[PDB]
């Protein structure tokens, strides 16, 4: 159809920026005990 060439870019980001935020603070946590 006739979608907003960037609607996808916004969804993709908005699902990484916020999401990654957690795959960041989480990981640093398990390493609170010299682990991956």
């Amino acid at each position: 159809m006739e979608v907003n060439q960037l609607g996808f870019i916004a969804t993709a980001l908005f699902v990484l920026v916020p999401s990654v935020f957690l795959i960041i603070l989480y990981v640093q946590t398990e390493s609170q005990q010299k682990s991956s």
Binding site: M1, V3, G7, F8, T11, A12, V15
Partner: peptide, 30 residues
């Protein structure tokens, strides 16, 4: 696209499910 996105955001709700039903950090009784 538009559909490719829809099937993706979805297939991760499926991963996110698998992950919290088997990668549940056991609840500790202390």
């Amino acid at each position: 696209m538009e559909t490719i996105t829809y099937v993706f955001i979805f297939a991760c709700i499926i991963a996110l499910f698998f992950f919290a039903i088997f990668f549940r950090e056991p609840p500790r009784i202390t």
